[PDB]
Amino acid sequence: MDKPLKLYFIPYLAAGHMIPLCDIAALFASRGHFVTIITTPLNAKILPKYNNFNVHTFQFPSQEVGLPEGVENLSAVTDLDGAYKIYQAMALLREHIENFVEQHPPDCIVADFLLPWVDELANKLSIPRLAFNGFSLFTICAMESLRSHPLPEDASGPFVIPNFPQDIVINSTPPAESKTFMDPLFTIALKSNGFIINSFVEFDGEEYVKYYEKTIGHKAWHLGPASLVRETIQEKAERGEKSTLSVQKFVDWLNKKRDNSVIYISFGTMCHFPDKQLFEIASAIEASGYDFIWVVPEKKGKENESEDDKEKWLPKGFEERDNGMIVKGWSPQMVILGHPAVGAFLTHCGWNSTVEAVSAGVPMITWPVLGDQFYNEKLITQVRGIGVEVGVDEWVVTSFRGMKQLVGRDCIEKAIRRLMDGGDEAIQIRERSQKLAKITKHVVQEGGSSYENLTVLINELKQLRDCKVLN
Numbered sequence: 001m002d003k004p005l006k007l008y009f010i011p012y013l014a015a016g017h018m019i020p021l022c023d024i025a026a027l028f029a030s031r032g033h034f035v036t037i038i039t040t041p042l043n044a045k046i047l048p049k050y051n052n053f054n055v056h057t058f059q060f061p062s063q064e065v066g067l068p069e070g071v072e073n074l075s076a077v078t079d080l081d082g083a084y085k086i087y088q089a090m091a092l093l094r095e096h097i098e099n100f101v102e103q104h105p106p107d108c109i110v111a112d113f114l115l116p117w118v119d120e121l122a123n124k125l126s127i128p129r130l131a132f133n134g135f136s137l138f139t140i141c142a143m144e145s146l147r148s149h150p151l152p153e154d155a156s157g158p159f160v161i162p163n164f165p166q167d168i169v170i171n172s173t174p175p176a177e178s179k180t181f182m183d184p185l186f187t188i189a190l191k192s193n194g195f196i197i198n199s200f201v202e203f204d205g206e207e208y209v210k211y212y213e214k215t216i217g218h219k220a221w222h223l224g225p226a227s228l229v230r231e232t233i234q235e236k237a238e239r240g241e242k243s244t245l246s247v248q249k250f251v252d253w254l255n256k257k258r259d260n261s262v263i264y265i266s267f268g269t270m271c272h273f274p275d276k277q278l279f280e281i282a283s284a285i286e287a288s289g290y291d292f293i294w295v296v297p298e299k300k301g302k303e304n305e306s307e308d309d310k311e312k313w314l315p316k317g318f319e320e321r322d323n324g325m326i327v328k329g330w331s332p333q334m335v336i337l338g339h340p341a342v343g344a345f346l347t348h349c350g351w352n353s354t355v356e357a358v359s360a361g362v363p364m365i366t367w368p369v370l371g372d373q374f375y376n377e378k379l380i381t382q383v384r385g386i387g388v389e390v391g392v393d394e395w396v397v398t399s400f401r402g403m404k405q406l407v408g409r410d411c412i413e414k415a416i417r418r419l420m421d422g423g424d425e426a427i428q429i430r431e432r433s434q435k436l437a438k439i440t441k442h443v444v445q446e447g448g449s450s451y452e453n454l455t456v457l458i459n460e461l462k463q464l465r466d467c468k469v470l471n
């Protein structure tokens, strides 16, 4: 504890994995250790500089992959080809990332599971390495249970998470493609010294800290929700990217509405719905009759469209009825969710949007799409009971307009009203969300669960540093 720790963080160029890992590095920075993010210049611009907080940037190889100069992240990508370029750009940056880390070795490396070449880098440098995927520990347990007990290849439809601490049924089977990409990353990540989770034990469940530790044989570190590291308005409003609309424009409009009278609809980054699907969402939004903040990244840069191009995805007269805000880009989600007017959230069950909703105490309407979201759907609705389900069952591998099954407006509206109409069910769901909200307020504060986990994590990293100094 006499000298601080030198920690490097290598976040992947994805909004869901860049945002949380930098906030997690800000928790290390608040303790007095020298953190350092290693990413591209555009992704490091939005990062507020704390104490000890520094970045090391290598220029994004735009013309090497074939991208415009303004695209250095997966959130600005609207095509499956773009995700390949973001990955290929990460392969080219692998050279200079390894060289910089070899020239100035840190006390510890924290790297994403999407980059599995950090294993050789930390090994030859004989330094402790931490893995990060931004999933829930509950989901990580569920995906390692399917890896030990594979589903029959023919089987499809709902399935039970095998040999779990709690009987849980996921609504659809994962794609066979998902297994071939995920399993190599989990195996390399399990070769790491520890796993960093942007969650707290009161939410994932202690029976899964004991499941991951004793059944799988690996250490996890509940350090989140790291979104709580941003306290001011400017810290909450600038995340990953500058907001598209003025943050005060949202607040002045939300301040005029009642409490729990606004629905926030955002399927996160990397999810783009076809125009038919957006039409069903829009029809179900106006049919519910509730004010809404709808994030539509599918139509960013497509403002003042001709009447033909707008009727492809919106009912005629939808924008004339000013009962909501259609944001075609980044939204201050921490700000919008924090406002007392938002009382419901239509989510893709992404983990960042999930813990941010638990902090703000907003119940969630679940619409999972890919990745860890179909496990998160059941963590929201069955395990913790802070949300209702739409009832979707399409588990795509790519979400870039790839969905082949149309979710009807009668299905969406039915779920929207189950939380906005204030029924007897919705009342106690919002009570269980407020119970977790009060707990979440001080899990990163002194004495909390995730706070003390970071205290233990630092001490063990300091120990390993003191052992290397002997040699």
Ligand SMILES: CC1(C)[C@@H](O[C@@H]2O[C@H](CO)[C@@H](O)[C@H](O)[C@@H]2O)CC[C@@]2(C)[C@H]3C(=O)C=C4[C@@H]5C[C@@](C)(C(=O)S[C@@H]6O[C@H](CO)[C@@H](O)[C@H](O)[C@@H]6O)CC[C@]5(C)CC[C@@]4(C)[C@]3(C)CC[C@@H]12
Residues within 6 Å of the ligand: 014, 015, 016, 017, 074, 083, 084, 085, 087, 091, 181, 182, 268, 269, 270, 350, 370, 371, 372, 373, 397, 398
């Ligand atoms: C196969 C390919 C298209 C890949 O192309 C290959 O590249 C290698 C490079 O050496 C070559 O050797 C091959 O010949 C070939 O060209 C490029 C892109 C790519 C890698 C994958 C990809 O970009 C992302 C995912 C992604 C992984 C995962 C675990 C995430 O964590 S995504 C992440 O978090 C959440 C998760 O829900 C997202 O919502 C966030 O926005 C953020 O992106 C799960 C989801 C997903 C989409 C699974 C597929 C893949 C591994 C993908 C698209 C497979 C295809 C692959």
Ligand SMILES: O=c1ccn([C@@H]2O[C@H](COP(=O)(O)OP(=O)(O)O)[C@@H](O)[C@H]2O)c(=O)[nH]1
Residues within 6 Å of the ligand: 015, 016, 017, 019, 239, 240, 266, 267, 268, 269, 270, 271, 295, 329, 330, 331, 332, 333, 334, 349, 350, 351, 352, 353, 354, 356
């Ligand atoms: O318009 C948007 C879209 C996304 N986000 C942020 O992007 C992250 C989305 O992460 P999540 O894991 O929920 O979705 P994923 O990016 O994995 O699809 C969260 O921090 C959101 O607050 C935001 O602030 N505004």
